Design brief:
monomer, TIM Barrel, 8-stranded parallel β-sheet, two-stranded antiparallel ribbon, 16 helices, about 45% helix, globular, binds D-glucose, binds cobalt (II) ion, binds magnesium ion, isomerase, Complex, Diffusion, monomeric, Xylose isomerase
Length: about 375
């Protein structure tokens, strides 16, 4: 049961199944993967498409000649399988030139180089059919308080994204940008550390309609925040352009576990939210098969990502469709939350004596919210103990 088909819109980064397992304390445990091979292996598992960094597909320092050979064979693999490329991004973190950042490096010449490297890959992304261009500023930040004037850094960050929007606008490209937040690692503190900081920042850009967020389960969980709550606020603002799905076990290093691992109940409430809201973008997996695994374990880990989404989707549909759950939701007054507080208006509210002078505060205090019975019904459905 629970088999993925291209209609489920599951996508994967080339850097995910392709991670060789080199972490801070150890050397790589797997051989490098050919991107053509990843495309074919992922198509056979039922994936909708792939994503990439420029440096995943074209090795850094490649001439214009070698570049076109790498793009050509990749394209052939896409043409042959029907795999899509819905999203692409730039590597502005691996090479030592970016050790203090790309867009917010203190050195001005590095910031201009960062912009040129990005613009080049946007042209390629659009050619391949990508609709979202992701920016993760993993090197934008500091280890010490005096190294970075954060107000000046935000001016430089705003300058770079405005320039990018002017570029896609002048070229007539039908592509949008999505900022991916992370609170720390590899820098001591990273700029725009959460979904909220990223949403606020977009509103100061010159063309705010071109920019949204690409939140990641584990990144918000590295700050101890409620990921479904943060997704709700991004949807409320009309800014959920893309999403990165994986797992994370609490506040620690970025684990990038397969989706469904880590905080399982949060994964259930996330899937409930994405499906009931009708999110229609890619279900992208940004995970790392643990370096304990050989290549058989890499493909099993990837399949597990899609399988866990499909199970949770089924459990959330059953939860919502259960008449007993619908009764529970009315008993907890979820339906009154959808009602305006004072659609009668400010003057009516001020003259309404039942809202203050004659409000029976003790009777309203004594009402039970009945939240625990509702939560146990959610638990029963998740576990298939009444589904
Ligand atoms: O290893 C890859 C990054 O750490 C990942 O978090 C970003 O999603 C990627 O750069 C795409 O922007
Ligand atoms: Co991560
Ligand atoms: Mg990510």
């Amino acid at each position: 049961n629970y088999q993925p088909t291209p209609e489920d819109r599951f996508t994967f980064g080339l850097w995910t199944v392709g991670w060789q397992g080199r972490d801070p304390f150890g050397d790589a445990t797997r051989r490098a993967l050919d991107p053509v091979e990843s495309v074919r292996r992922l198509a056979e598992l039922g994936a909708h498409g792939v994503t990439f960094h420029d440096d995943d597909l074209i090795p850094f320092g490649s001439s214009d000649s070698e570049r076109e050979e790498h793009v050509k064979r990749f394209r052939q693999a896409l043409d042959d399988t029907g795999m899509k490329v819905p999203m692409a991004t730039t590597n502005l973190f691996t090479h030592p030139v970016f050790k203090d950042g790309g867009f917010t490096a203190n050195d001005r010449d590095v910031r201009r180089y960062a912009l040129r490297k990005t613009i080049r890959n946007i042209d390629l992304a659009v050619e391949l059919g990508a609709e979202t261009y992701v920016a993760w500023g993993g090197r934008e930040g500091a280890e010490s308080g005096g190294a970075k004037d954060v107000r000046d850094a935000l001016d430089r960050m705003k300058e770079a994204f405005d320039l990018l929007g002017e570029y896609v606008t002048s070229q007539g490209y039908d592509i949008r940008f999505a900022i991916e937040p992370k609170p720390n690692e590899p820098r001591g503190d990273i700029l725009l550390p959460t979904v909220g900081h990223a949403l606020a920042f977009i509103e100061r850009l010159e063309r705010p309609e071109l920019y949204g967020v690409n939140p990641e389960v584990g990144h918000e969980q590295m700050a101890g925040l409620n990921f479904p709550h943060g997704i709700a606020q991004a949807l409320w603002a009309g800014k959920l352009f893309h999403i990165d799905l994986n797992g994370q076990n609490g506040i620690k290093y970025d684990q990038d576990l397969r989706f469904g691992a880590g905080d399982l109940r949060a994964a259930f409430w996330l899937v409930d939210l994405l499906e009931s809201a009708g999110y229609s973008g890619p279900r992208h997996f940004d995970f790392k098969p643990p370096r304990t695994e050989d290549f058989d374990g890499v493909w099993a880990s990837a399949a597990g990502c899609m399988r866990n989404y499909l199970i949770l989707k089924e459990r959330a549909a059953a939860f919502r469709a259960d008449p007993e759950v619908q009764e529970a939701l009315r008993a907890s007054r979820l339906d009154e939350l959808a009602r305006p507080t004072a659609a009668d208006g400010l003057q009516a509210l001020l003259d309404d004596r039942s809202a203050f002078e004659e409000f029976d505060v003790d009777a309203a205090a004594a009402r039970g919210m009945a939240f625990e019975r509702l939560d146990q019904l959610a638990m029963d459905h998740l576990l298939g103990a009444r589904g």
